[PDB]
Design a protein around this ligand. Structure first.
Ligand SMILES: [Mg+2]
Ligand SMILES: [Mg+2]
Ligand SMILES: [Zn+2]
Ligand SMILES: [Zn+2]
Ligand SMILES: [Zn+2]
Lengths: 95, 336, 31, 277, 56, 214, 86, 205, 372, 98
DNA sequence: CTGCTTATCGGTA
DNA sequence: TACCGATAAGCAGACGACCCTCTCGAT
RNA sequence: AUCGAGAGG
């Protein structure tokens, strides 16, 4: 069943943060991508058995992070890129 | 006039009436139509418009402004509607179905905006109310930093009544045989009659009690006393005079110092904002202001003793209690 | 409505730009 | 007990849903807003009931508020880029003298207010006092013929579409003006848009009929193109066969367009839950 | 759903018959009735989700 | 009877509202000087015939030595009323030099009908001197007297530096007030200058809100 | 810029535990209890990993620290021992 | 006036039959014959009022009030005879122009409350006040529409999930906007635990 | 759920929206993208170095995702690029690219007003990249001439000729003077020479977004996981609506290779530029008044990345703010006087369906082992 | 509703031919100022001219319809006070009894 | 029903 | 007394439009 | 999977 925005607002009101994530991560779509530490995109080619990661051309081989987001998000970001917009995903707090 | 003539006639054993009397379903209007008459029918403010030229139905002449022609149903649902009456009522009810099908569309859009606009407003760990940027919206949530669930409509009875009727209630005058606390009420009754160290404090309170009465009448210009405030006191009082079982024919054991300097020290620690600088403490004072006008009006020297004869323990509990019940009514940082 | 479309309207739709440059359409028969 | 009045297409029964529309060839005056310069408009949805589907609409606009300095009366013509004052139109038709112009509009000698209301037009008029430049104001011999066709083909296509009737159209246009000011003077009420006697229902016939036009005219021009390629019998009946089906099948009343907003199922899939259903 | 009270936690009582059942007095806040409304139900899956349900 | 009496009365009340305004800025005026009765206005500022000359009203003002405690750099403020309906850039050259020479800081112009777009261009042309153009219709009643208006209290550059740490805000993160706001005009606000408004609440008697100025 | 922090004293924050604070505490513990982790109270005869954390709450024995945030970025720490629970 | 027929007669001081008509237009619809313009019909109504008695009680004093069909505050309060300390407009937008921002806040509330309470329903002040306050605090009157709040400079991802879904993201791509991710909506999208009640704080050992 | 990863787990904290530099676009990818044909090469159902594959994802659930492998339930889908020979505009930026062209001089390419103008002094100092641009443009649309020099007589750069009164006409920009139509290639070189200090003034950022990227030099090609394939068919054949429009771009981009390096006419290449523009415009939006779209092997009109994200049913407001989710249930309610307030009668068949992950612990084994 | 139908459609011009044969003056040959007590006549929203004394013209029209001589489906509205006579033969007029 | 172009109105050049 | 340039009422454009849910029909 | 029609609260 659709857990729509109109319901989400009711979970926010209540203050239940964890449930509201669980219900939008474990149930429905969750996903694991690899982000580059220099450029904040999904360029990284995940060779997940030879440990070799590499953000090619971009010349990175070390700075790479595993993150947990919904697939519908990843999808949204790829679509935004294909439309020629870079949505940078960074990991550390300050600028 | 017809309806409230049927309402008068309906026996106490009349089922319809008994559901109204309970409030389970039904109201006056429902009875009026069912037995008396259904009344005038309307579409967009005005009674039934001329749809045909200069008439409402082709069963009528032109230029007819009488009741039945323009949409009055003289009949009850129990008697039955007439052909025209029927059609007329049809027009009227159909209007209800229409706007409802458009209210719910308009509303559902209102709400989605409302929700989308205020969204990220939450009270942070300091009672400051702000958004995602940190733009203050309120400095204390709901101008007083109190969660709305814990709040009840209590009468602020410093506002009401004659100046005569107010002195009669709150004024204690130790250097006045007539306007003193009869040794009936207090243990130290007559052994206080006179005195000047304890009329400085008794005066002290009575002065604030009058400073309050004007300050309130200034805010709630209406004369309306009953106002949503934290911690129900009328109850904590009852819950003392039955919890400690105290007769209304034998005296107390409280000093005048015990009363007056208690209330003032309770006031001292009804915390809402907890910072230790200049500004913060003035907000703190301001956020309680209204609550305290109540506190003071009910924990008044004469009141405590003449109205609801407390005892040293029971009074010290009533304070211990209030402080605790108040501390709970604060909004929790997090609340969205 | 369907009987007007069969008995009178159909013949009419069949006769207006019917004629060409010749080859022209005449009476219309329903089975 | 089955009463019929449905079609059977691929086993499933289909109903043709009566379509409702405002009626053609009737004349209506409409008070217009408050921030708009035109205060009254008189409209007619002129179309011929037997032959084609060409919706030419005429507007008799009454520029200017009450109190506003001099109320002109212009008119809207199909294909024409702008708006023409009515007195040029009357002269574009046949009538040239003012006062015979008013004879087509105002059907009484006494009604001074009426006439008073028209003064502002005559004034807009005597920039042109003749047949030839009345039509010329429509934008040499090329463009008079552009106007002389338009006032016969496209202007008030009912009454007639030929040539030999010019006072037929004059009187009517006059009657539209009569009707517009009759209400601007608040001597008659505005026209009621929800009056059921001026709406029509388009039934199973007239629905098919306008769809049949389109399909038959499609097949009539497929024949032309098979005749051209002869340069010196094999007709694609599949068109009229399966074109009437698609429309009766879906609800997209109109073949392979769908950009026609008729999408709303015309042709719904009966409904046999109960007999009274 | 236009409340916090439109969406609340409950204790499960497994029963026979294929209708969801609730107590009459939990009517007003959902704005239900029994003329044939349909109701939804979501299940927590991690320990805290259960805490965060039953405590808030 | 006139009609010149209604033009006087509206000008009398216009005066009132200028006094209250000026003391509220932080300046020195008695409570006797405010409540100048109707009789006493015509027999002080009017001329031979019985019509009011306004160049006659143009008084000055200086701060209560109480306002020099909080605001050191506040000093010379000057009011001037105006006779002309048509006020262009030619009388604006007349009044800028006036202030330029006397060494004021703040000037109040009180025009009766309109200010031309040319006259406005010759206002921020002298630093740090300032001038505020007030219409008279805008001044017949004191807006701060009305029920809905709570009293705003201009605070110091050092009292702000205090608020801006006791709530750890950044200037941005206040609720803002308009430079053109009817009240913020009446008290003279510049960018950065934060008022403080003491509203009466049905939830707690008083509540203090703050607004930085746009 | 870390580590700014806030000193043990000069705390302004409700010493009381917010409903949200503890709901997440009990949760946090109820998670690690249900994963057969060591328990710091005498199980008087309950087997529900979340009632066990409710009993560990009652007797102040949950070794976690609530870290509260203030808008600028500063933060106050509160042990589960110090916070009153009412 | 005491005549049976009332007449005005007016002459000027070629083309003059035309320009006597441009005066007749101006004469009818530009001649303020008295009172304030914009204002239509005005009705005297006998409003109730509770107010202090000498003795102290609150007793009913019946008060004649005026009710209008149009708005020009700038020019009705500046009138002799009326109390210009209580005059009210149901237009909170004119109140904002005339009596300042903070006076508007209260009329905007006075309004919102008057919707809710007229129908029966009571709602607690913290709520309507907060709306009111959110609208009022940007400086002017920020609407609850795509033009109002969804404009003010909040981290792009948030404003996306409202109305101008793509153009937000678009000009966000061009101005190189930075997103804090302190907003609810931003963390629903990223599928993380949103800084809300339960996630407002942090847990450590 | 998936697999071990030696890269550490972290939460997102900042999101920095920017723009794609052609230099990145073709350095970021693994694609060549020569052929507008999908799979078959004379019936051969492999994949082919044309569209979706060369060093990209898979379809027949084959491990092969170019060495990366891990099936299609792990591979994020690797981006591509397509080399347009001639610069084309960027649909949603038409409104802004024009606003800069009404703000920056022609021929020389520099700001129209410096710190010399007394009103432009009040614009350059203001905070917020958005309202700064909102002040400048309203004060540069009036000014035409490049100017000799502004009064003190102080001197700077200057080229002379007037700035056009630039209008929007569908996909192109026309200009008057005192008519020449402004090519895309032209504005490439204009924004390429803009001064480093000239970005920051009008709402940009040195490295993240630069006005030469506002216009499209090199187009990113979205991987299969953004536009999948088969339905009730198999083996033939069909596919999603973004694969059609990319072919429509490719076929009109390889159409300008056979008109520049072959028999090259003069005034008939523009009849092929306005369609290569139109396809890269429509593939990113088609709701602007003029012309919608055709099939081209389906119906009417077309999707387009924009109307994939537009709210309600869209990727954001309808797949992110509100997801369809698991562990749920729905049935008719009915009321029960003999139940407790905080309770809820679940039907058994539902109780038999939903579930809770319960980890075994000495406390529960006896109840659990029984349960299994 | 129960008793309602639709107008299927008839032919206008054998009504046209009857009117002109019963004293309807055609529109071309019309003089407004000279024919003031004249009732204008439309058929299907087309002005075919004017008719003096429609009083008897209507009774003749009625009698033919109520015999079946003129299709019973054709509706004929005389307005006394607007002085008009519109005979309608459109397709899709809804109608009932009675 | 908030963007921009046209119809409008002034002093100094 | 001629042209610059400042500018508000006048006039044409537009991205929103309830929530969740169940059947069945055609390319 | 896209579009569409009917219906439930
Ligand atoms: Mg129901
Ligand atoms: Mg019901
Ligand atoms: Zn990289
Ligand atoms: Zn891969
Ligand atoms: Zn230049």
């Amino acid at each position: 069943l659709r857990f729509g925005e109109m319901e989400r607002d009711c979970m926010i009101a209540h203050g239940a943060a964890s449930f509201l994530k669980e219900r939008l991560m474990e149930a429905s779509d969750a996903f694991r991508v690899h982000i580059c530490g220099i450029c904040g995109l999904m360029t990284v080619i995940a060779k997940l058995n030879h440990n070799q990661f590499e953000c090619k051309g971009c010349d990175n081989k070390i700075d790479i992070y595993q993150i947990h987001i919904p697939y519908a998000a990843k999808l949204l970001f790829q679509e935004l890129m294909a439309m020629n917009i870079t949505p940078r995903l960074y990991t550390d707090r300050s600028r | 006039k017809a309806g409230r003539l049927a309402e008068v006639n309906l026996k106490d054993l009349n089922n319809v009436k008994q559901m109204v009397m309970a409030g389970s379903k039904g109201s006056f209007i429902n009875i009026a139509q069912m037995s008396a008459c259904v009344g005038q029918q309307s579409v967009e403010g005005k009674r039934i418009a001329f749809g045909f030229v200069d008439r409402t139905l082709p069963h009528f002449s032109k230029d007819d402004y009488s009741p039945e022609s323009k949409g009055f149903v003289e009949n009850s649902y129990l008697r039955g509607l007439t052909p025209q009456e029927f059609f007329f009522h049809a027009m009227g009810g159909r209007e209800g179905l229409i706007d409802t099908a458009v209210k719910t569309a308009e509303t559902g859009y209102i709400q989605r905006r409302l929700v989308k606009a205020l969204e990220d407003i939450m009270v942070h760990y300091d009672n400051t109310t702000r958004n995602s940027l940190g733009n203050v919206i309120q400095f204390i949530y709901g101008e007083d930093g109190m969660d709305a669930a814990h709040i009840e409509k209590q009468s602020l009875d410093t506002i009401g009544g004659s100046d005569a009727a107010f002195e009669k209630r709150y004024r204690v005058d130790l250097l006045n045989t007539d306007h003193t606390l009869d040794p009936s009420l207090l243990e130290s009754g007559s052994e206080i009659l006179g005195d000047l160290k304890l009329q400085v404090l008794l005066d002290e309170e009575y002065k604030q009690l009058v400073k309050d009465r004007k300050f309130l009448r200034e805010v709630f210009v209406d004369g309306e006393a009953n106002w949503p405030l934290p911690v129900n006191i009328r109850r904590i009082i009852q819950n003392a005079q039955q919890t400690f079982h105290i007769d209304h024919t034998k005296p107390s054991d409280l000093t005048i110092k015990d009363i007056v300097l208690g209330v003032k020290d309770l006031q001292e620690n009804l915390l809402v904002l907890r910072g230790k600088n200049e500004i913060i403490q003035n907000a703190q004072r301001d956020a309680v202001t209204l609550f305290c006008c109540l506190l003071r009006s009910r924990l008044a020297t004469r009141r405590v003793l003449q109205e609801y004869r407390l005892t040293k323990q029971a009074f010290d509990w009533v304070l211990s209690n209030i402080e605790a019940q108040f501390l709970r009514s604060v909004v929790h940082p997090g609340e969205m | 409505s369907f009987n007007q479309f069969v008995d009178y309207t159909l013949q009419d739709i069949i006769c207006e730009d019917s004629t060409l440059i010749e080859i022209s359409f005449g009476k219309i028969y329903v089975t | 007990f089955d009463m019929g009045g449905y079609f059977i297409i691929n086993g499933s029964e289909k109903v043709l849903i009566a379509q409702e529309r405002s009626a053609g060839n009737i004349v209506q005056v409409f008070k217009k807003a408050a921030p708009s310069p035109i205060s009254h408009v008189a409209e007619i949805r002129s179309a011929l009931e037997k032959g084609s589907r060409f919706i030419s609409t005429l507007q008799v606009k009454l520029y200017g508020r009450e109190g506003s300095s001099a109320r002109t009366i212009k008119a809207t013509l199909p294909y024409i880029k702008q708006d023409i004052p009515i007195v040029i139109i009357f002269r574009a038709l046949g009538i040239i003298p003012d006062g015979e112009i008013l004879e087509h509009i105002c059907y009484d000698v006494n009604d001074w207010q009426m006439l008073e209301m028209l003064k502002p037009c005559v004034e807009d008029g005597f920039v042109i006092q003749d047949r030839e430049t009345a039509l010329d104001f429509i934008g040499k011999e090329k463009r008079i013929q552009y106007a002389k066709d338009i006032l016969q083909k496209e202007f008030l296509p009912h009454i007639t579409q030929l040539e030999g009737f010019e006072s037929r159209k004059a009187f009517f246009l006059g009657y539209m003006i009569n009707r517009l000011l009759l209400c601007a003077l608040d001597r008659k009420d505005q026209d009621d848009r929800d009056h059921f006697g001026k709406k029509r229902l388009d039934l199973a016939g007239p629905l098919l009929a306008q769809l049949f036009k389109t399909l038959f005219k499609k097949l009539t021009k497929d024949i032309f193109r098979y005749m051209q390629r002869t340069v010196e019998l094999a007709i694609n009946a599949k068109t009229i066969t399966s074109g009437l089906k698609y429309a009766l099948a879906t609800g997209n009343w109109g073949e392979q367009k769908k950009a026609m907003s008729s999408r709303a199922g015309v042709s719904q899939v009966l409904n046999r839950y109960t007999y009274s259903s | 759903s236009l409340h916090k009270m439109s969406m609340m936690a409950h204790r499960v009582k497994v029963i026979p018959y294929s209708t969801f059942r609730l107590n009459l007095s939990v009517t007003s806040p959902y704005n239900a009735d029994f003329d044939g409304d349909e109701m939804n139900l979501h299940v927590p899956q991690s320990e805290e989700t259960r805490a965060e349900l039953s405590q808030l | 009877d006139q009609e010149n009496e209604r033009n006087i009365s509206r000008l009398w009340r216009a005066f009132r509202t200028v006094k209250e305004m000026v003391k509220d800025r932080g300046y020195f005026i008695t409570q006797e000087e405010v409540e100048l009765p109707l009789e006493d206005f015509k027999a002080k500022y009017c001329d031979s015939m019985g019509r009011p000359q306004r160049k006659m009203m143009s008084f000055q003002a200086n701060p209560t030595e109480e306002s020099i405690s909080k605001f050191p750099d506040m000093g010379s403020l000057w009011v001037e009323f105006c006779d002309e309906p048509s006020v262009g850039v030619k009388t604006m050259k007349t009044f800028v030099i006036h202030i330029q020479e006397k060494n004021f800081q703040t000037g109040i112009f009180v025009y009766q009908n309109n200010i031309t777009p040319s006259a406005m261009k010759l206002v921020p042309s002298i630093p740090p001197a300032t001038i505020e153009t007030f219409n008279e219709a805008a001044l017949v009643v004191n807006i701060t007297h009305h029920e809905l208006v709570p009293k705003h209290i201009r605070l110091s550059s050092d009292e702000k530096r205090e608020l801006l740490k006791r709530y750890r805000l950044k200037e941005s993160q206040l609720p803002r007030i308009q430079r053109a706001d009817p009240v913020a005009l009446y008290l003279g606000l510049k960018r950065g200058e934060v008022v403080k408004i003491i509203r009466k609440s049905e939830t707690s008697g008083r509540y203090a809100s703050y607004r930085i100025c746009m | 810029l870390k580590e700014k922090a806030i000193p043990k004293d000069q705390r302004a924050t409700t010493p009381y535990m917010t409903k949200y604070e503890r709901a997440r505490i009990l949760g946090t513990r109820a998670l690690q209890i249900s994963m057969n982790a060591p328990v710091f109270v005498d199980l008087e005869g309950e087997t529900d990993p979340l009632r066990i954390a409710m009993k560990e709450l009652a007797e102040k024995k949950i070794p976690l620290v609530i870290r509260r945030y203030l808008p600028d970025g500063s933060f106050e720490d509160w042990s589960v021992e110090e916070l009153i629970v009412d | 006036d005491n005549d049976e027929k009332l007449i005005i007669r007016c002459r000027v001081v070629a083309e003059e039959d035309h320009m006597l008509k441009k005066i007749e237009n101006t004469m009818l619809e530009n001649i303020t014959l008295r009172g304030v313009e914009n204002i239509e019909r005005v009705v005297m109504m006998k409003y109730d009022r509770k107010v202090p008695s000498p003795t102290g009680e609150y007793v009913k004093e019946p008060e004649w009030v005026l009710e209008t069909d149009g708005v020009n505050l700038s020019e009705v309060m500046t009138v002799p005879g009326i109390d210009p300390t209580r005059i009210y407009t149901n237009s909170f937008i004119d109140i904002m122009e005339v009596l300042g921002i903070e006076a508007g806040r209260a009329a905007l509330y006075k309004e919102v409350y008057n919707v809710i309470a007229s129908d029966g329903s009571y709602v607690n002040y913290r709520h309507m006040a907060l709306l009111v306050d959110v609208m009022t605090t940007q400086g002017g009157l920020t609407s609850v529409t795509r033009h109002g709040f969804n404009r003010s400079n909040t981290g792009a991802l948030m404003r996306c999930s409202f109305e101008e879904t793509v153009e937000i993201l678009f000009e966000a791509g061009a101005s190189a906007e930075l997103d804090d991710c302190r907003g609810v909506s931003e963390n629903v999208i990223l599928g993380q635990m949103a800084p809300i009640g339960t996630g407002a704080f942090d847990v450590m050992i | 759920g998936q697999q071990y990863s030696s890269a550490p787990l972290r939460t997102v904290k900042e999101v920095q929206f920017g723009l794609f530099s052609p230099e990145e676009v073709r350095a970021i990818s693994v694609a060549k993208i020569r052929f507008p044909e999908t799979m078959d090469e004379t019936q051969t159902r492999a994949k082919i170095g044309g569209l979706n594959d060369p060093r990209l994802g898979s379809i027949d659930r084959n491990l092969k995702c170019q060495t990366c492998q891990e099936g299609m339930n792990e591979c994020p889908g690797h981006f591509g690029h397509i080399d347009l020979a001639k610069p084309v505009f960027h649909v949603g930026f038409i409104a802004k690219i024009k606003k800069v062209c009404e703000c920056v001089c022609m021929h020389c390419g520099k700001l129209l007003l410096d710190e010399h103008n007394e009103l432009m002094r009040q614009a350059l100092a203001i905070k917020d990249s958005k309202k700064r641009f909102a002040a400048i443009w309203t004060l540069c649309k009036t000014k035409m001439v490049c100017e000799t020099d502004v009064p003190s007589l102080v001197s700077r750069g200057g080229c002379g000729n007037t700035q056009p009164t630039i209008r929007k006409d569908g996909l192109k920009l026309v200009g008057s003077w005192k008519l020449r139509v402004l090519s895309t290639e032209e504005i490439l070189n204009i924004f390429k020479h803009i001064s480093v200090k000239d970005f920051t003034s009008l709402g940009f950022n040195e490295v993240f977004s630069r006005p030469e990227w506002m216009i499209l030099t090199c187009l990113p090609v979205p991987p299969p996981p953004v536009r999948p394939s088969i339905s009730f068919n198999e083996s033939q054949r069909g596919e999603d609506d973004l694969t059609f429009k990319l072919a429509d771009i490719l076929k009109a981009n390889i159409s300008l290779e056979t008109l520049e390096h072959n028999g090259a006419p003069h005034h008939a290449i523009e009849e092929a530029e306005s369609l290569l523009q139109f396809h890269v415009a429509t593939y990113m939006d088609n709701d602007i008044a003029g012309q919608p779209q055709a099939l081209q092997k389906s119906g009417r009109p077309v999707k387009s990345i924009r109307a994939r994200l537009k709210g309600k049913e869209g990727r954001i407001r309808g797949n992110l703010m509100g997801k369809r989710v698991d562990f749920s249930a729905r049935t008719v309610i009915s009321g029960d006087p003999n139940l407790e307030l905080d309770q809820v009668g679940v039907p058994k068949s539902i109780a038999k369906t939903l579930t809770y992950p319960e980890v075994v612990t000495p406390y529960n084994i006896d109840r659990l082992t029984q349960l299994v | 509703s129960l008793m309602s139908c639709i107008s299927v459609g008839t032919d206008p011009m054998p009504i046209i031919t009857f009117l002109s044969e019963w004293g309807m003056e055609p529109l071309e040959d019309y003089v407004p100022h000279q024919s003031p007590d004249a009732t204008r006549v439309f058929v299907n929203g087309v002005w075919h001219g004017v008719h003096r004394n429609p009083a008897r013209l209507m009774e003749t029209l009625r009698t033919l319809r109520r015999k079946g001589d003129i299709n019973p489906e054709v509706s004929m509205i005389r307005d006394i006070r607007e002085k008009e006579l519109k005979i309608f033969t459109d397709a899709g007029r809804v109608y009932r009894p009675l």
